[PDB]
């Protein structure tokens, strides 16, 4: 053929891939974390937006730390041979490096490690997108006038 360039990811596999949305709204009372009013609006917005991008969306609601880890383990071990990419959206409380299950924290590294180039061969060389709506600390940006 003619000259070719390899500057973009192959996005024309039979499927665009999974879009896992974890929508954590209500937290076990013993944690002392407040309900995240409005996150259902986020969850439905994301579901529709990625539906139209032709992602296979799975909405999960109010998962424990254990359920988040298991879901990530299970999803990583699925057959991604026909999938272009992977998207995981996390909606929860958090702090730097951490997001919360309904019953306690999960290290972000623990979640993303399931998809490492060597631990998830189904996705090696394929874009893995983590979209994280969660606090990263307690600092407030006072902004500056323009």
């Amino acid at each position: 053929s003619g000259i070719s360039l390899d500057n973009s990811y192959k996005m024309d596999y039979p499927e665009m891939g999974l879009c896992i949305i974890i929508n954590n709204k209500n937290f076990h009372k013993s944690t002392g974390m407040t309900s995240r009013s409005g996150t259902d609006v986020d969850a439905a917005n994301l579901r529709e937006t990625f539906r139209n991008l032709k992602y296979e969306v799975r909405n999960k609601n109010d998962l424990t730390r254990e359920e988040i880890v298991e879901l990530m383990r299970d999803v990583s071990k699925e057959d991604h041979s026909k999938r272009s990419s992977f998207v995981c959206v996390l909606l929860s409380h958090g702090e730097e490096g951490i997001i919360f299950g309904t019953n306690g924290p999960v290290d972000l590294k623990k979640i993303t490690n399931f998809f490492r180039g060597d631990r998830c061969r189904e996705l090696t060389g394929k874009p893995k997108l983590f979209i994280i709506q969660a606090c990263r600390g307690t600092e407030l940006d006072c902004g500056i006038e323009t």
Binding site: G38, T39, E48, T49, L53, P127, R136, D141
Partner: protein, 93 residues
Amino acid sequence: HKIPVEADFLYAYSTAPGYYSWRNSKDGSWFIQSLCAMLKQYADKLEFMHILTRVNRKVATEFESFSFDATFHAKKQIPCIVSMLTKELYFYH
């Protein structure tokens, strides 16, 4: 012939390191609101980083917190794009 195991991840953070992230109980979070609008408007036209750059500007310019508590009133937010991607990403083909 090998690639790093950390390659080909992108982390679209709603807020800068160390900071709160703002959520509106009626409208949804500032970040997710803006991300969905920019995806809808530009996913058939722009590369992913350039979409996410529009999300940054939208969150940075169009949103400001309102609170009866002086500590939390009038605050701003910038999201944080973290890319270990090795290629450009277009949602179309």
